[PDB]
């Protein structure tokens, strides 16, 4: 019974960890796209 409770807790904690990690990964994804565009446009402006 205690192993069942512990594994339920662990699965829920893995749910929370995966949710937080996915949020952080999406923030990083957006930041990378924005930074790449900033570099591209800055280079283009330097040549304008």
């Amino acid at each position: 019974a205690s192993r069942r409770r512990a594994m339920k807790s662990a699965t829920d904690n893995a749910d929370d960890l995966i949710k937080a990690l996915t949020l952080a990964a999406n923030r990083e994804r957006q930041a990378q796209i924005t930074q790449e565009i900033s570099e591209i446009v800055g280079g283009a402006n330097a040549l304008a």
Partner: protein, 464 residues
Amino acid sequence: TAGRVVRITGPVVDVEFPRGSVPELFNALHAEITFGALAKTLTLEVAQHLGDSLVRCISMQPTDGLVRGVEVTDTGASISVPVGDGVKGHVFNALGDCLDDPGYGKDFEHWSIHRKPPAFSDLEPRTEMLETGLKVVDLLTPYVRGGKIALFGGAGVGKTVLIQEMINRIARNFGGTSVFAGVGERTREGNDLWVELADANVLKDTALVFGQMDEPPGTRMRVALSALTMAEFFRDEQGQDVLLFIDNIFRFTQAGSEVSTLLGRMPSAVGYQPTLADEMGELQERITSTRGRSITSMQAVYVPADDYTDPAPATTFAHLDATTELSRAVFSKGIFPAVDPLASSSTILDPAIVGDEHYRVAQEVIRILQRYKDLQDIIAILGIDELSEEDKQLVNRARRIERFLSQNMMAAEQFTGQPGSTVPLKETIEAFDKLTKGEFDHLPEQAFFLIGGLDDLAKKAESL
């Protein structure tokens, strides 16, 4: 007073005019490609005034074959689409040209696609619910009259049949009409929708406006405005309740981003146009209820990278009022419509709007279904026998409730002999209240498939 093409850079065209005849912004100009293979008439939308009597314009058609110096004509108005009852049962492009009957509608009244939302004093300060007659939608995720509904669903989960059902219901239970806006419409799917609506006989009640995927970004950006213009004419001039469909709104946003990139504007966060929110607001604020008539909009939303914080879905959801998730799992059960009762949501499902009893019944249904979903994995792996008698009876109750959430739709008649059913909201609320209480467990499960109110439940009970 005609202009002449000066520069051609893909879909972007610069046009010079005499000093006193520079067109207004968003005016539709015409140019001619005369090369035999690609001969056509380009429609150019004035985007910017560059100075020196030059205007930067977005071509609504591919510029291949265009020649510098060709005459450019100014129509004196922005893109205007035909309006009236004549647009029903026909297919138009973003510019108001009929696709199933070229030259049709040329003589109708024409409305500019750029219009302002209703004045502040003319908006309705009280939110209202749109009773559709569908049990699952009416109870769990009530629709807002004049509101916005996101539609989510994978292939083959009845999205097309649901759209047909909503067309039927708006036309039959409200004396209204439907405008379908295919933004980034696949030509194969556009033809399929045309043929399917014709076969279902509901094409007479709907006007299709396709900005197709193989078009430059300008038409894909303006097709939603064209469809919304037709809908606004129906709401304002014909005094009808309209049901506007947009698939896909994300493609409207993406076409706007592409147009912004072509016009040399610095991209915003995640590379979207700087005016993403402004464009979304301009589109969505026109879908409202005004002086007793409303445009309700069901919009397919694509979420990039499944990231709901992405600027496009984040901006779109600021305007949405309800969500309808079509579930593959639900569809595979034979339940129609395949609406996910737990993934779906509605912002007006609160006591202040739908009353206390509607909220109470809906929350009880949600709790029961959530418990059943939680127990589903145990059922599948360790078996039902493992669950306690309380869990077994809860599972039976939840199975009956989810079966009763299904309904015989009016769009299903073309597939099955029986016609569709409409269920008054009060009858739905009381029936689901009783079902949650456990007043029909003794009845068999199959009795709850594809029926309407309690009378149909009783009849199917004797039938089995």
